[PDB]
Design a protein around this ligand. Structure first.
Ligand code: CA
Ligand code: CA
Ligand code: CA
Length: 98
DNA sequence: CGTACGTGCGTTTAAGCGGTGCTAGAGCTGTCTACGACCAATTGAGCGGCCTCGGCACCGGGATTGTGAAAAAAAAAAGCTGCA
């Protein structure tokens, strides 16, 4: 009768994104396992590339510029273009919401 | 068995050297504050747990697709000449 320990996952957000993308389409347990393995992976790859960018330039802080550079380094062409576009929107919209 | 490449010639080219002169820009300083750590207190987003019900796995049965043989038609190909 102990409550089971927490296990975070991006799965509520994957669903919310899916419901934008294809409102009438769902996803199996194991397909979610993968979408989660993905998000974590690309997270770890970008954070890691952004870490090294900072570290090379003798920088204490990983800013949104070290992410963007790390995104250009990591992503293929049109993914990178679109990935930067959506990132740069997000920060602009954040700042105008104070 | 055909000609694509390696060899080796003579001719041509610009890489490499060693040097000189100009300056963009790498990299350093010192200054100063906007921003991020840390903090505590506050609170609602996301967790586990639970219950439901519709998608999809599983089924049988018939429709449609794809292969291979067999017999048959078309096919190149094979032993025989003449005529020059
Ligand atoms: Ca500043
Ligand atoms: Ca749940
Ligand atoms: Ca349902």
């Amino acid at each position: 009768k102990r409550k089971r320990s927490r296990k975070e996952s991006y799965s509520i957000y994957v669903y919310k994104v899916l419901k934008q993308v294809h409102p009438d389409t769902g996803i199996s347990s194991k397909a979610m396992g993968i979408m989660n393995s993905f998000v974590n992976d690309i997270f770890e790859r970008i954070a890691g590339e952004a870490s090294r960018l900072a570290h090379y330039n003798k920088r204490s802080t990983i800013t949104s510029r070290e992410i963007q550079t790390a995104v250009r380094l990591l992503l293929p062409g049109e993914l990178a273009k679109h990935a930067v576009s959506e990132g740069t929107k997000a920060v602009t919209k954040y700042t105008s919401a104070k």
